[PDB]
Each structure stands twice: as C-alpha cells, then as structure tokens.
Design a protein around this ligand. Sequence first.
Ligand SMILES: O=P(O)(O)O[C@@H]1[C@@H](O)[C@H](OP(=O)(O)O)[C@@H](OP(=O)(O)O)[C@@H](O)[C@H]1OP(=O)(O)O
Ligand SMILES: Nc1ncnc2c1ncn2[C@@H]1O[C@H](COP(=O)(O)OP(=O)(O)O)[C@@H](O)[C@H]1O
Ligand SMILES: [Mg+2]
Ligand SMILES: [Mg+2]
Length: 311
Amino acid sequence: QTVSLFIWLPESKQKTLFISTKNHTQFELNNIIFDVTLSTELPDKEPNAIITKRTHPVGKMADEMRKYEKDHPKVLFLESSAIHDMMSSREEINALLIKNNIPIPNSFSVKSKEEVIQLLQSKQLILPFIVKPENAQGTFNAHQMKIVLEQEGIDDIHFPCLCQHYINHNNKIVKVFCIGNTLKWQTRTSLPNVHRCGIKSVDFNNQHLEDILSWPEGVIDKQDIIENSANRFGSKILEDPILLNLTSEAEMRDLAYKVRCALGVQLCGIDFIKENEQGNPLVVDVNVFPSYGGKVDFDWFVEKVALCYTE
Ligand SMILES: O=P(O)(O)O[C@@H]1[C@@H](O)[C@H](OP(=O)(O)O)[C@@H](OP(=O)(O)O)[C@@H](O)[C@H]1OP(=O)(O)O
Ligand SMILES: Nc1ncnc2c1ncn2[C@@H]1O[C@H](COP(=O)(O)OP(=O)(O)O)[C@@H](O)[C@H]1O
Ligand SMILES: [Mg+2]
Ligand SMILES: [Mg+2]
C-alpha cells in the first residue's frame, strides 16, 4: 500500500524546525510505502494527509487552509484548522484539561477586572497569579505575561485573559514533545520563585525573558538573581528531567497520552511544572506542532509522522 504525506510549512518554520530539508523522500515503514513531499504551498494533487502548522490565526495561510479542508474532506490534517483554533485559546485548552481531570494550577478565564476582583474577594483566585492572554499562539502579544503579586497589581491587565495561580516551581520546566505516541522530552529553566515583598506586579514577554533583569528588587531572591543573570534569565536547557528526579518516563507518557486524548491532537508540546519540584505534574501550556527542541532531523521527523499516521 502507498500513502502520500504532504508537509506544508513556510520557510520560517522549516528553518527553526529542521537541520536540513528534502523536497521529496520515499521510505517503507510497516509494509507501507510512504511518499513525503515538503512545500511552502498547498499540494496541487490531493495527498492522504497534510502535515502543517498554521503560522498565524488570521491571514492567507489560515484562509487557504480552511478552504482546502472544506473542499478536500478525505485529507487528514496534522494539524486541522479546528485543532489550531482550539489551541489558540487558553480558555478552550484549559477547559478541556479540566474536563479530562488533568492537573493544572488553578485557572480562570476572565473577561474583565470586575470578574478578577470577585475571584480574589471570594478566595478562589489565590495570589500570586500569572496573567496570560486569551490568544495563545502566533503573535508576540500572545506571550505577553503579567505576574500579579498583590490585589493592586490587577490595574493594567489586558483582557480577555487567563488568570492562573503562580506556582513556585524552583525554576525548572519539563517540556514533552509529541508526534503521536513518539515522545521527546527535556528540562529547561523557567521562571524564578517569586516573593511578595510589596511590589504589586511584574511583566515579561516569554520570548523576551531578559525583561526579568528589570524587575524591582525583592521579587526575586538575590541568589536566584546571581544564578540566572549571566544567561539573562533565558530559557536554558538543563539536565534530563528523569535524571533530575523531576519525573519518570512512565509519568510523561501517561500525561502526554491523556493530553492528546483530551485535546484530540497528535503533534503537540506540553509544558509542566511541579510545586517545589514535587507532587503532581501541573500542565501550564500545550502548544500545537512545536519546534521539538529546534533543528531536528528531517528523516526522523517524517518517519515518526508516518508511524503516527498508521496508528
Ligand atoms: O518548540 P518550543 O521550545 O516548545 O517553542 C515553541 C516554538 O517557538 C513555536 O514557534 P514555531 O517554531 O512553531 O514557529 C511557538 O509558537 P508561536 O510562535 O506560533 O506562538 C511556541 O509558542 C513555542 O512554545 P514554548 O516557548 O512554550 O516552548
Ligand atoms: N502557573 C504558573 N506558575 C508559574 N510559572 C508559570 C505558570 N504558567 C507559566 N509559567 C511560566 O511562564 C512561562 C510562559 O507561560 P506559558 O503558559 O508556557 O506561555 P506560552 O504559551 O507563551 O509559552 C512558562 O514557560 C513558565 O516559565
Ligand atoms: Mg510555554
Ligand atoms: Mg504556549
């Protein structure tokens, strides 16, 4: 049997994702011949599956994608407009995680300051909390965060947004990347433990972690400033999370399967932290079709996508 897989990615994504690329490749896996094509443009001829990350929620690619899906219903998408749309909403992601009993830090999707005030006053939302935009993917603004340390720190929040209790997790985050059942994982630095010293809020963009160098004195312990300032608080690779005793392979596989089932996604990245590095994994982010650690092997990627397709 033959299966055609078509990888539809802009050059920008191709460059961040792959060490190198091939326009066309053919291989056998589990008694099936796979023909794989890579292009920046949609296929002229209908494949069995299109493998794609939509670059931005709105624009030409989004429009082309929806039209193509409607007009070619037999083509499997990894991943579809509907999946990208859901994963562009922090509300929708977290609602599905909650519905499927996947631990997260306590989270509230809010549309206004009055709502935040009511959650604080009723002791549902506990300080400190991180404020994440409702829009989750494809813009600089999607990654613009505020940590609210005191009630007064709510004044400049951008709505709508997710308010999520801030967990002191000792500045380690576990990243689990999935191509279906195939996983790759790592530990990175994250954010420092924070202190409620009187400062009302601080801000950072997750793409510009050097913002943290400008936080007022007292929010971060002086030793944490010493340990992280040389790297400008950048997201740095650490030792393997199993070797660090942060998690186990079985835990990561279980969690990843649960998340994939909850969200109906095959190509994703899951971020989790642990309070004081102990206890349940707390999922803080799920991303569609991530970078897989960046600069991955093209042949590896396509074989694992084919395996996923068969399953
Ligand atoms: O692969 P990563 O390390 O999880 O980082 C991704 C990645 O940078 C991705 O961009 P792209 O490589 O798919 O173009 C980001 O998506 P957007 O820029 O479209 O929003 C993700 O936000 C990153 O996720 P994170 O930094 O949480 O790891
Ligand atoms: N509830 C939380 N408590 C503490 N730190 C958090 C929490 N949620 C996220 N973070 C930190 O903030 C960073 C950005 O949050 P994340 O949800 O991953 O946003 P993005 O989707 O922009 O990557 C994470 O990498 C982690 O360091
Ligand atoms: Mg993240
Ligand atoms: Mg994200």
